[PDB]
Amino acid sequence: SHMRVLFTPLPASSHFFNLVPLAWALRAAGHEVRVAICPNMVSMVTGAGLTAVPVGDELDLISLDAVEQLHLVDDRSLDDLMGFAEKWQPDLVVWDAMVCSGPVVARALGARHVRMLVALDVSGWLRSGFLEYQESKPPEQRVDPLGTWLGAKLAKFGATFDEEIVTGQATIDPIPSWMRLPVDLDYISMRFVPYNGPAVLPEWLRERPTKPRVCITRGLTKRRLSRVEQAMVERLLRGAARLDVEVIATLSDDEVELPSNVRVHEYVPLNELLESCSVIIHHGSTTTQETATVNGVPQLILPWDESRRAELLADRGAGLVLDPATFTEDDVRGQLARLLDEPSFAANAALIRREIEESPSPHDIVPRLEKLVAE
Amino acid sequence: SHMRVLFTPLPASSHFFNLVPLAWALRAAGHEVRVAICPNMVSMVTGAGLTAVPVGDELDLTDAVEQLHLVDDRSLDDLMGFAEKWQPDLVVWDAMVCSGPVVARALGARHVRMLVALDVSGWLRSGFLEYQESKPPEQRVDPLGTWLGAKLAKFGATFDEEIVTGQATIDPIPSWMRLPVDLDYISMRFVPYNGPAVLPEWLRERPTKPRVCITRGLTKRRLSERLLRGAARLDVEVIATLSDDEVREMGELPSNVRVHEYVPLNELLESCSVIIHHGSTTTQETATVNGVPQLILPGTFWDESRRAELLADRGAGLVLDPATFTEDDVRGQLARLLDEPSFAANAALIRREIEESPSPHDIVPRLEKLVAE
Ligand SMILES: Cc1cn([C@H]2C[C@H](O)[C@@H](COP(=O)(O)OP(=O)(O)O)O2)c(=O)[nH]c1=O
Ligand SMILES: Cc1cn([C@H]2C[C@H](O)[C@@H](COP(=O)(O)OP(=O)(O)O)O2)c(=O)[nH]c1=O
Secondary structure, X not given: OOOEEEEEOOOOHHHHHOOHHHHHHHHHHOOEEEEEEOOOOHHHHHHOOOOEEEOOOOOOOOOOOHHHHHOOOOXXXXXXXXXXXXXXXXXXXXXXXXXXXXXXXXXHHOOEEEEEOOOOOHHHHHHHHHHHXXXXXXXXXXXXXXXXXXXXXXXXXOOOOOOHHHHOOEEEEOOOHHHOOOOOOOEEEOOOOOOOOOOEOOHHHOOOOOOOEEEEOOOOOOOOOOOOOOHHHHHHHHHHHOOOOEEEEOOOOOOOOOOOOEEEOOOOOHHHHHOOOOEEEEOOOHHHHHHHHHOOOOEEEOOOOHHHHHHHHHHOOOEEEXXXXXXXXXXXXXXXXXXXXXXXXXXXXXXXXXHHOOOOOHHHHHHHHHHHHHO | OOOEEEEEOOOOHHHHHHHHHHHHHHHHOXXXXXXXXXXXXXXXXXXXXXXXXXXXXXOOOOOOOOHHHOXXXXXXXXXXXXXXXXXXXXXXXXXXXXXXXXXXXXXXOEEEEEOOOOOHHHHHHHHHHHHHHOOOOOOOOOHHHHHHHHHHHHOOOOOOHHHHHOOOEEEOOOHHHOOOOOOOEEEOOOOOOOOOOEOOHHHHOOOOOOEEEEEOOOOOOOOOOOHXXXXXXXXXXXXXXXXXXXXXXOOOOOOOEEOOOOOOHHHHOOOOOEEEEOOOHHHHHHHHHOOOOEEEOOOOOOOHHHHHHHHHHOOOEEEXXXXXXXXXXXXXXXXHHHHOHHHHHHHHHHHHHHHHOOOHHHHHHHHHHHHOO
């Protein structure tokens, strides 16, 4: 192997999935890749065929001092990682934009670090707002709580603060260029490649449909909590079925009696499904969204700023939006009917898809990173 | 570009793992990748992060040789059915299956055969291809060509030599081990995928004495023969820590034998000074790219011998005559690998060479081009 690469993803499937392909792209180049993950999400990682370094105490990131844990930057955890990291000596850490964990270790270690977005650059945009204001102030008042508080963890390992710890040496952007918030950083445009958990293709998913297909999903991380109202889905699902189509609703144990043209599963490999859908209806989250977008499928979204990206997608003519408060089954139907009927969306979605499939693939990104490590 | 690519592995762990990196290589490149697999084993596919496509009936390794080569009706028909539909551009096939290339020919998709052993099929085949040429036209029987040709019939298809060897063969075996055979060989850098891998605590702490790693295969582990006891029992005889394999009982292990059911092979090998293995390929190769001097007690049921013999030629291993190796052989040899900086000095040279080979990553634009030729 040339490079030893460490990933520090947030401990939740969507945030993790969004790392998988690049992880492998790298692997396929011949670099060693490890994924650092709290020891209860271990088999998530192993599941994507990647090697998992359990680190810290268990964490039910969903159910969630307490502020520290969420971003993997608390004492208990960081130390373990740092402990391995120290021993392991990666040349590069690629880190989910919501954990501080990995850049702390990176600076402590001197290894290049790269932030990867699973959403619009709020952190960086905001952070940008700030740096500029703080700018004009009386130098003695140039406060920076985020920075200093970090410098303290940082100092724990003989490291000092840098702007870099907040936004990384680079930020890899998988949401499409046009959608990307204006904020003057070094952005690396990567084509989103879908990984949707473990994918098995059952027989029924092998034939062309015979009525136009509709997908109705909310990925895991949302819905799933629940676990310990509700109403909107049965609304969406009722409204949807009013139209002469097969609705695949991807649901957990919960209800209810359903329309005849509606079939329900706990998990179906979405990407695969979406090759055969005519319209997707989803809840604005991001891995779900691009799998849709990346598959040319027109969209019906019920909303990061899940609104904003869904608004942005609306705008460019590949989808529409309802308001989760004021929405009635009618709007569901009528909206769906538009998406399925006026072929602009079908079209507008394809142009966006063609666009997407010409941004650099993960595979295309690898050398751009080796390049970065050689500097 | 944007290909639709289907893999068709022999359904064994070794075999499938050997394909994973290329599989991912391509998905990473934004290609759709699909793995045709007997129902009972789809977990292994999903386990590696690739999309399983369940095909045929169960299979445990419709007359047998046909099932064992993925070429029975149940499989073939399934594989076709789906293939017809998904209409792949490229089919990559486990050199020991016939299902891929058939379905491939049938829909006129470029296919490519992928190797796991050396190339005994090709060696043997082309030998026959040479000999038959030197016979009169009325006598040049191709028993294999007929046998394939027929199946092909089913689907509107003719036989072509390419069904036997692919339109090109991807060789992950270090090219100096390569049997002399005139084919379109694509050299590929072995990239170990070993199954599911998690870092155990023990493996965090730096080794305090040489780490020897003994693996039965894996996986197989058939039967379920204790040349393995005599294996372990005469390494203990030197001051080394031994990481093992299995949950088999043979009375009292010595104290320096740290047994663990499953280890992650790649990872493990990073602290190891030596490895004793059965001579199989992911094992050999995982070990080779790790620069680890090997002791091979090979045999057996394929090219394990020749390759163990070839590695040995380049002074990076030593070999043990199974069934005739004494306990004191397994030390006196072990000891040679640990005491002679030649064996690592080589195990490095070879490795280094392999890293100069192109990666799965590097092999994409070529298959890309193959498909658009
Ligand atoms: C429910 C469900 C989810 N998924 C996958 C698709 C996505 O990759 C992932 C969810 O992504 P996302 O919508 O980003 O999840 P969340 O908003 O809850 O974090 O789960 C399926 O593939 N099939 C399914 O049926
Ligand atoms: C026992 C064991 C096997 N393995 C895996 C890694 C290799 O890819 C595979 C070895 O299979 P291989 O060498 O191909 O032999 P066989 O053909 O008998 O299966 O087993 C581990 O990763 N760790 C382990 O502890």
